[model samples]
Target: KVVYIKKIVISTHADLKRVSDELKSGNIVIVELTPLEQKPELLKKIAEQLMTTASIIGGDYAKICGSPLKVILTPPEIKIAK
Candidate 1:
């Protein structure tokens, strides 16, 4: 069976938890962090959590660009090119 992918834009710290929770449930999420670009600390915190969540779940995490606009989170079975 094929699964559907989801795209999520996170502008607040609260949304970070939702993104991680969604990852925990085995769904792929394309996260946009552009909204937090002006807030370095908040962005760092979310990035750390996203890193840990992906690590814990054996998922893939990637930062698509320097603008910090795109992040890819996928399940354990998915592998993205570095």
Candidate 2:
């Protein structure tokens, strides 16, 4: 016997409006974590990573965005969230 998994198709939102729509409906979407490598992290993870990285560019420019930052405050949290 053999085991296999099927792949599904997902699309990305072009704007914040689209994102909000997806969130409200709990729609499935895709985000590329590594462009070179086809690896993906969920929207939550991506939000957290972006928040961490953008924090360095603070001063009203970073403008804290997404729930990841709230979800992933520390490295340990990231591990636990997984």
Candidate 3:
């Protein structure tokens, strides 16, 4: 089987918005969150909102790395491991 994936590089708030929409539409996304690490509160906010969305949409969220890159959001049937 073949699968389609969306990879997003988020350097600012704008990128975050775009990825959120993509996720809502049921796309698998690999998100890079390093740009917001400097602003820890903002990063936390974003993560919380995304996680909430995932729950509502019956999807799963995982942070693949600790630093610059993180997270794949998809259906619960899909598994992403660190």
Candidate 4:
């Protein structure tokens, strides 16, 4: 048996209204763990489409449009090789 895990990075809050350019205002991206990794091109497939919300740590959530932190890896494989 094996389990899969994913990694993601996000901001603490929103920023200027860069989306509208009226003031660079927008929500933050909330990064979450996903089982599907090989499905998308990691982040390139979904980065500027994520929506933001209240952060889990207590703060403004941002769009989890995906970042460089998101990736696919198997812990079982690593352990078996090591």
The pairs that clash in candidate 3 are: none
Cα lDDT of model 3 by residue, 25-52, tens digit: 6578888887787888888888887787
Instruction: Report the number of the highest-lDDT candidate.
Output: 1
- Global Cα lDDT for candidate 3: 0.74
Question: What does candidate 4's lDDT look like per residue over 26-77, in tens digits?
Answer: 2222244243334455333343333221222223223333533342212212
Give lDDT tens digits, candidate 2, residues 1-82. Answer: 2222221122343332343333234332232222212334564444554444324322011222232221212111112221
Question: Which ten contiguous residues of candidate 4 have the minimum total lDDT?
Answer: 16-25
Highest TM-score against the true fold, candidate: 1
Per-candidate TM vs. native?
0.80, 0.23, 0.73, 0.20
Residue runs of model 4 more than 4 Å from their true location after superposition? 1-29, 51-82
Residue 13 accuracy (lDDT) in model 3: 63
Error of 2 at 73 (Å): 17
Model 3 misplacement above 4 A: 76-82
lDDT of each: 0.80, 0.29, 0.74, 0.29
Better of 2 and 4 by TM-score: 2
In Å, residue 22's CA in model 3 sits off its true spot by 2.6
